[PDB]
Symmetry: none
């Protein structure tokens, strides 16, 4: 199939729901060790897929969105911005944390929290498509 064992195929990418829960930086490194990156939601189709995939889990899952503080915009790991009107970022969006602020999805909603906190994560890499 287009995706390795345990990875889920969606669009032109493969997605993996992490086996462990760690802070954002470590979660990022874990995806990197798998030739992947943290979840990057580029459309409503992507969001819907992720929401459906997690289904009724009450666990929090890191995505690749972060920022130094409220004065900075929400950007994906590659530096590209969060496309408007895909989702609203709830939670701790007013405060400033030393390790910065990172985004995660929990119960279908997206929240901002101290990057030092722990959560599961979703990694993604390009699918093998001719």
């Amino acid at each position: 199939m287009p995706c390795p064992q345990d990875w889920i195929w969606h669009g032109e990418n493969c997605y993996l729901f992490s086996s462990g829960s760690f802070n954002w930086e470590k979660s990022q490194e874990k995806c990197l060790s798998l030739d992947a990156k943290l979840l990057k939601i580029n459309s409503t189709a992507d969001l819907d897929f992720i929401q459906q995939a997690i289904s009724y889990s009450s666990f929090p899952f890191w995505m690749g969105l972060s920022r130094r503080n409220p004065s900075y915009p929400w950007l994906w790991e590659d530096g590209s911005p969060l496309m408007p009107h895909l989702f609203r970022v709830r939670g701790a969006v007013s405060q400033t944390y030393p390790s910065g602020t990172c985004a995660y999805i929990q119960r279908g909603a997206v929240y901002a929290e101290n990057c030092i906190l722990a959560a599961f994560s979703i990694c993604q890499k390009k699918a093998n498509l001719r």
Copy 2:
């Protein structure tokens, strides 16, 4: 949203069979899993299937068949093949005792004697 080993796509789940059998037995195998043989309703469905097995050289039965050339190609549910989806290549002119059935191989659709062996693709609704 789909059982283990099945591929989630849209509101459906797809299974690329582990066994290669004739069309009737392949039909029965999908039925035993409360599923049906592949029914391509759009270019999007065809694109998905082609991508799913974009590197494979194996033949996979779909739910399209007909008794002989005098009858139209119909899916298992009796609905017709939508125009401009794909051309059915291969053995479309001859008549076989058990009818003619369609399979996809290397992204193209072919017709052949239903008693021949091929893998198959089953589909059923996803648990959304």
